Amino acid sequence: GPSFCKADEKPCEYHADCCNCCLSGICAPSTNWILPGC
16 A cells, blocks of 8 residues: 555665665665766
C-alpha cells in the first residue's frame, strides 16, 4: 500500500535495504534528477 518496507529518513549505506533509494547515507524517495538512483 502507500508505505515503505524498511524505513525512511534512516541513514544506511546499501540502497538494497530500502524499496525507495538510500541516497547520500539516507533512506529517501527519488530525490534526484541527473544523478542515478539505485
